[PDB]
């Protein structure tokens, strides 16, 4: 359905499509495809519209970040800050203090979240491509998405930047100590049937847990769903979906549609006859050799629950609507919003992304990263997962 | 249920003419012009009881006379209770159906309530026809009305509203039956107003209109008098039809279908619509 | 399972004013035929009277000439098809294994390592689905609650689709005429994916996809006549209302005949 | 004959404005089906690279799960359907016996005083008609000179239709695929008579009548399996040119689907 | 037949570019760009014999510079002979089609006369395509021109007129292949253009039209030299589409089928039309 | 005449932020805080009366106010009558238009000159259709340097990619719309044609339409003359490319969106 089609002299991709369906109470799967493909997955418009925005949201971070010039780390933002980004790089690169500070970075446009300050960011913690920030990236080689999001309005991109921001803090934290707050029953009836559809379905195939892995007294609740089977006829036998939101009831809900989109379209690239050279992206081709019982089996049997009862119900509490902002400051004031704005017919459009020093600048601990950073240092949580990366996507 | 159809009963002096739908008889009988007196003024229903009683009065055989008035069209037997218990009227025009709940009963059309749009805490019984009549279109009115009542049970929707030159009646919602809502109606006649000379309407201008938040509200002609005396008469058939006295069997591949009319020419147009690709109102 | 299909894969070839154009067509013919509507609607054009004149006739390509060339009926070694089961009694059980029965030899191989059907379909794309719906209470059932099932006719398996309950079930299945049709055991519904009847032909798709539904509920019918079930192809059925019953979207999926199943008598 | 129908008193009954609904739709489908357009067509929207992963697979209601209830091929007692003839052959002669063996069986009940026939039909009006044409030389004729005839299924005989020459009528038949066709004895073509198909019920009248053919070809599937011919259901032909070559009026009728029958071998 | 496709051979200095519809290429050969400037002079067709002499004077291997050309969309190789052997052009307008024929011998049609309407005695052979193009539409024209040719062997007719602001193209009317003619089409575009909103147009005023010589013109806005320009190039591309160098194959669904188009929004459509019931082309 | 444009306002602890479409601001005053808060409601019109009662309610001062925010973005003055009293086509093949001002006077189409592309010696005002049957990046680039700057100036361009005849946007400095480069960039965006036009470029030399014939030129000729027609008014008439397959005759409109990157 949709079916929209652009030729190779277009400014718009090859292929728009939402999928068909036999079960009514099933998610609307829609795709975005031209030469990855971006996609996304729930209730019919916005299933379009999580995929036309994360399209745009690729796009941009790909192809379309302009620079500002080319500024040393405390030429181009206040000097708190830039003692911030020096030991993150510090930690990311070979590269020593000296040339980090005197070394002229290609900068972006950023505000401070909490004071509105305005100042500039380095541009290659933000692009993701060779070159925008060239000679920048002996200092910070890998980069990624963490923290990115695309909307109509300023306010929502903040927002999905900032779920965003938590979902991926709180996942690695989660990964690298094995600390979650709580578990959900595995045999919740969430009422929504598209929800309740896709657990019923999981759980005929293989195991579901659900953990609460929120970042230790956040607001909100960061809820990552899990899949495991044994079952020889299934080829999915390992998937996650993980989402961030004030509500437990929404968290849970995203994050079992994640879930279910990672989980269907690794099965149709499989049964597709797709092969390796299909796979492009580096997390992408990661998760593939995570499929496999093993990698639920070592996340569940080394979980720690902060609490051992199994939470029945999708009940509120004294936290989690408490100010996500204020909790955030506490830990750090170092936290920018890189942001950008383009017109479409007489509207705005807008990408933003949540980048801090003090916090995970990407979320591949197999690469270079700040290790020490406001919320984890070496040697806290388990030894080997600091040097393995998360079986995420 | 008796139901009494249109007739007339004229005399002067010597002769007594009836005249229905069906037929015109020349009445020779003294007790069947007092039934047909009798029916006369009786709007809409009566109980099979009141017209033996009717006819008893006169000296008519129950049987022979029920056999009169049904074949010469002057009432019907009805057996089957319908799939809505009662309809109501919600609009921002209720001013325009003031009489209508008390002038439909002849026409055999149960109608609750009248309800202004403006209202709150506005309730609904199950098994109600919710019929929502707009002078001044937004979509968010039909929202507002979807999220109230759509898990009703038994619950149906009719929307009216004009576009255009045109009057439209959309299809029968009727969650439980599963048939295409407003919003699948109003974007087959979005497409169809579009200069594209393609039935497809769906470009990546599309898709970025589909990025705001949908809220609309429609072109229009100025109405008068006689295109609300047109609208009310529409309104009330297709009521009729669903609800009320049946005067003519529709066929099934019809019966749920929008009826749209050209209020310059008064051509009727009955077309059954399909769920739009992008609405949510099959996945609720 | 072995031989899934995505329908992603269908939908990247898809001419979207094909499929608009197809489905504004097909909707045409839809049907609101429920109790409720009995007295306010109707289903045939010709009167009852009439009707007789038009059943099981011949028209001549010369009308008024009979000047042929007649073939005997000594070259006939087939049975009469029975009389098409109606006022069906559920009085006896009826095992979930004359059920197989049916569904194994009217759509599938009998090596179950092969792919070849027992009709043949355009381009072998094979667009239309088998559904079961199980309407008597006197019915044996797989899986408890369960009542609506897809047949997948490669991998010879019901696949669960919906716990409606066996009255909303046949009450949308019968539509208006339930009073007549009586108590069958369980229906078949045959159902159109437009999006892969069209995919490939295009609008002849279309026409191939129905065509290929009449291969299978007759295959359906000479299977039941062989195993003692008495049936009837039925299409007085409210189409929209069945789909939602059976937890279809609409969108992409679409019933196009519902056939009957169970004994006649006592 | 005994059983004759005039269309006259069908047309009493047509709804104008459904007829010329159906008939713009129907014409959608038709092909323009050539040799002489081979290179300057296309029939599949599919490139021949990807064709084999849509072909003979299922379509799942819970797509990449795989929870079933798998049924046994024990249960099953037929047949497998053969391999759809292609690349015919007539170096043998085929007797005009075993075509009356085909369409007696197929489309007639054994008793020839019977009006039930082999396969069902909405309202029992019978909308399609089958026509036989004789495609090679080699093939027997009941009427010299006569290669198209249109079957009575009631008065099981046949009616003479046209004189058309033997290269012509399997010219309009193949369409643009007749090298790889090769040369059939026969074929009976299906055809539907618009304003029967669609007087009782409207719009979903040409449903029912479009699976009505296929229930039909369907007969002639199995029945050709029996007694020893391949067949081919066929749909790359263009319409019109049949109906011309086949002295019908398109207003009136129009041919559904092709059907071939005939050896396969040296 | 080799067909030679659209391309260009550019160079200034050191560099060489084939640009055509499919690739762009680099060429490093010295006899290759030699070639290549051989085949653009070439106006459409070219025989196999003179190509492998082109390859041969630059030392190409004939199987292997074969498959560069065929590869790079230079040419391609077709094997199969047409339905219809040539084409004429008839039309009121014949200065509008002065250069036609030696123009579009380079998109591989082959047109062997311009014809006058106003001429006497104008001949066909068998299997050619009658392309009748009116500015001033009259339906006598057609049917003297059916008159004359309808029972030419092998015969086709296309037609082109305008039509309120549209520009018509007839699906081709062969009687071999029993395809709607001229009057067919005329009727489906009369009747879509009234005011009726019902698809069949028929009521007691038609049948008392059709007691009338059949007998008719229409209404059409003023035509510039752009609407020629546009018609013109229409008329190429449906004529190269059923006789000459196919660029793009067309789906057998709507290769006979007519083809409309806007003047003023510029919009094609392209719709098989039915047999209209009280014609009788079918019955010829 | 007074079009309240979009914009954003983020505001904390104490702070406040206005973000438009070409600035950032930090607001410092409370009182444009809440003319800033007020004037976020609009969606694209006011007359001054509106606009100085708003402001003289906030107490700002009405005159420097309005200077604020046509400066920041936020406001501007849109032209209450249409934008163009004429066009001017320039062209490299202008011999294929000398009869265009003549014809198209007839469909309210008002061309003043015909401009041959190799020249050197554009009033206010003014529609620029640039046609090139040559496509060159640097020719069009040459056409923006002379008149870019013009009063009420605007330009299209046309050209051919292989098979296709392309109509850009049309890019108005005033109104704000995207530029041909913007077009170029989000195509290539996605041997390639960057690969193509590089070389061009790199070894100088134009990009050929492929063979086009008499017919091809007319087909063209009668779009430029519809399109014209077209722009003689909401925003997406602006922001909107044509594509027209010369092979096919199918017209194909699509969006346009700026590139960041670019300058325009
Ligand atoms: C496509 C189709 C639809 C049908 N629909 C109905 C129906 O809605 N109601 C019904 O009673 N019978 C239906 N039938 C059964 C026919 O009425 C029956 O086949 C016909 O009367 C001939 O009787 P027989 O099958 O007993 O020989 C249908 C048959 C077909 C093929
Ligand atoms: C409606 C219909 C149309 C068909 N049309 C064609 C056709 O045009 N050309 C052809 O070669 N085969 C045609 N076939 C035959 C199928 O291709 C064949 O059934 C399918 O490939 C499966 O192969 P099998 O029948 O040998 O098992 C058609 C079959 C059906 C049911
Ligand atoms: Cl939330
Ligand atoms: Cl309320
Ligand atoms: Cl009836
Ligand atoms: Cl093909
Ligand atoms: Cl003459
Ligand atoms: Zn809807
Ligand atoms: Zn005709
Ligand atoms: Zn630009």
């Known amino acids: 359905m949709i079916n929209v089609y652009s030729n190779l002299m277009s400014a718009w991709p090859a292929t728009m499509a939402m999928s068909p369906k036999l079960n009514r109470n099933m998610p609307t799967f829609s795709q975005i495809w031209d030469y990855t493909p971006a996609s996304a997955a729930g209730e019919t418009l916005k299933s379009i519209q999580g995929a036309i925005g994360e399209y745009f949201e690729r796009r941009h971070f790909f192809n379309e970040i302009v620079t500002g010039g080319q500024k040393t780390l405390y030429e181009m933002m206040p000097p708190s800050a830039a003692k911030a980004f020096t030991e993150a790089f510090f930690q990311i690169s070979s590269l020593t203090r000296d040339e980090i500070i005197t070394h002229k970075f290609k900068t972006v446009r950023a505000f401070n979240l909490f004071s509105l300050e305005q100042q500039e960011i380095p541009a290659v913690i933000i692009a993701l491509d060779n070159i925008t920030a060239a ?113 437990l009831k929404k968290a849970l809900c995203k994050s079992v549609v994640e879930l279910w989109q990672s989980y269907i379209c690794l099965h149709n690239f499989l049964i597709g006859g797709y092969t390796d050279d299909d796979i492009i992206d580096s997390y992408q081709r990661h998760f593939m050799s995570c499929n496999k019982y093993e990698s639920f089996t070592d996340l569940c049997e080394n979980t720690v629950l902060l609490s051992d009862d199994v939470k029945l119900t999708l009940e509120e509490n004294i936290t989690s609507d408490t100010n996500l902002l204020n909790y955030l400051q506490q830990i750090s004031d170092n936290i920018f919003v890189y942001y950008a704005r383009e017109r479409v017919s007489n509207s705005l459009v807008w990408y933003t992304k949540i980048v801090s020093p003090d916090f995970f600048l990407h979320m591949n601990n197999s690469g270079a990263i700040n290790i020490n950073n406001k919320i984890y240092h070496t040697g806290d949580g388990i030894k080997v997962r600091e040097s393995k990366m998360v079986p995420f996507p | 249920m008796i139901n009494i159809l249109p007739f007339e009963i004229i005399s002067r002096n010597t002769k007594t003419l009836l005249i229905t739908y069906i037929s015109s008889v020349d009445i020779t009988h003294e007790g069947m012009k007092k039934v047909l007196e009798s029916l006369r003024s009786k709007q809409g229903i009566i109980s099979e009881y009141l017209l033996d009683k009717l006819l008893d009065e006169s000296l008519i055989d129950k049987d022979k006379g029920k056999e009169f008035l049904i074949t010469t069209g002057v009432i019907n037997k ?135 938040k949908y809220q609309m509200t429609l072109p229009a002609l100025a109405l008068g008098e006689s295109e609300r005396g047109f609208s009310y008469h529409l309104i009330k058939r297709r009521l009729q039809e669903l609800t009320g006295t049946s005067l003519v069997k529709s066929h099934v591949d019809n019966f749920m279908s929008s009826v749209s009319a050209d209020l310059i020419t008064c051509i009727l147009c009955k077309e059954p619509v399909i769920h739009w690709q992008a609405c949510s109102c099959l996945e609720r | 399972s072995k031989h899934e299909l995505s329908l992603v894969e269908v939908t990247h070839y898809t001419d979207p ?49 009979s000047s042929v060339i007649n073939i005997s009926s000594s070259h006939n070694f087939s049975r009469e098809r029975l009389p098409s089961g109606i006022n069906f009694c559920d009085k006896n059980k009826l095992s979930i294994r004359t059920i197989e029965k049916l569904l194994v030899n009217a759509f599938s191989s009998p090596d179950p390592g092969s792919v070849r059907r027992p009709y043949p379909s355009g381009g072998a794309l094979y667009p239309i689905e088998v559904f079961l719906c199980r309407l008597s209470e006197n019915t044996e059932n797989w899986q408890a609650g369960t009542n609506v099932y897809h047949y997948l006719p490669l991998s010879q398996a019901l696949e669960p ?28 519904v045959y159902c159109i994916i437009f999006e892969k009847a069209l995919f490939k032909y295009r609008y002849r798709g279309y026409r191939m996809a129905l065509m290929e539904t009449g291969s299978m509920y007759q295959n359906a019918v000479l299977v039941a006549d062989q195993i003692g079930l008495k049936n009837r192809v039925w299409a007085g059925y409210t189409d929209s209302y069945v789909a939602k019953t059976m937890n279809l979207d609409q969108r992409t999926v679409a019933p196009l005949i519902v056939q009957f199943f169970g004994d006649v008598n006592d």
């Not at chain 1, 009836?189 to 659900?210: F, K, Y």
């Not at chain 2, 439209?168 to 919003?183: A, E, K, N, Q, W």
């Not at chain 3, 045409?28 to 059943?55: D, I």
Request: hydrophobic residues 35%; contains cysteine; glycine residues 6%.
């Open chain 2, 78 to 212: 009805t057996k089957t209770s319908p799939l809505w218990v009662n309809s109501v009227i919600i609009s921002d025009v209720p001013h325009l159906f003031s009489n209508a709940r008390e002038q439909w009963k002849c026409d055999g059309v149960f109608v609750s309530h009248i309800i202004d749009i403006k209202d709150n805490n506005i309730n609904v019984s199950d098994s109600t026809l919710i019929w929502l009549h707009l002078e001044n279109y937004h979509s968010d009115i039909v929202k507002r009305i979807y999220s109230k009542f759509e898990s009703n049970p038994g619950v149906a929707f009719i929307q009216s509203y004009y576009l255009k030159e045109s009057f439209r009646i959309d299809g029968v919602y009727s969650p439980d039956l599963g048939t295409p809502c407003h919003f699948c109606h109003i974007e087959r006649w979005l497409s169809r107003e579009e200069k594209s000379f393609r039935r497809n309407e769906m470009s990546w201008a599309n898709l970025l209109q589909l990025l705001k």
């Open chain 3, 17 to 65: 004013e094909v499929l608009a154009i197809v489905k504004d067509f097909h909707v045409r013919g839809n049907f609101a035929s429920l109790p409720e509507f009995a007295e306010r609607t109707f289903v045939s054009a010709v009167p009852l009277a009439h009707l007789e004149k038009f059943e099981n006739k011949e028209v001549l390509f010369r009308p008024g000439f």
């Open chain 3, 161 to 188: 689709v919906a716990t409606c309950n066996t009255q909303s079930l046949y009450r949308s299945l019968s539509g208006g005429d339930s009073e007549r049709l009586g108590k069958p055991h369980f229906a078949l």
């Open chain 1, 135 to 247: 000679d920048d990236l002996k200092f910070y080689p890998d980069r990624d998405t963490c923290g990115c999001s695309f909307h109509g309005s300023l306010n929502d991109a903040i927002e999905g930047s900032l779920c965003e921001f938590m979902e991926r803090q709180s996942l690695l934290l989660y990964w690298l100590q094995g600390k979650a707050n709580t578990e959900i029953s595995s045999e919740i009836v969430t009422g929504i049937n598209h929800i309740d559809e896709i657990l019923l379905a999981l759980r005929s195939e293989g195991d579901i847990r659900i953990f609460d892995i929120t970042l230790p007294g956040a607001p909100g609740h960061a809820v990552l769903t899990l899949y495991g089977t044994k079952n020889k006829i299934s080829r999915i036998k390992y998937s996650t979906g993980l989402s961030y939101a004030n509500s």
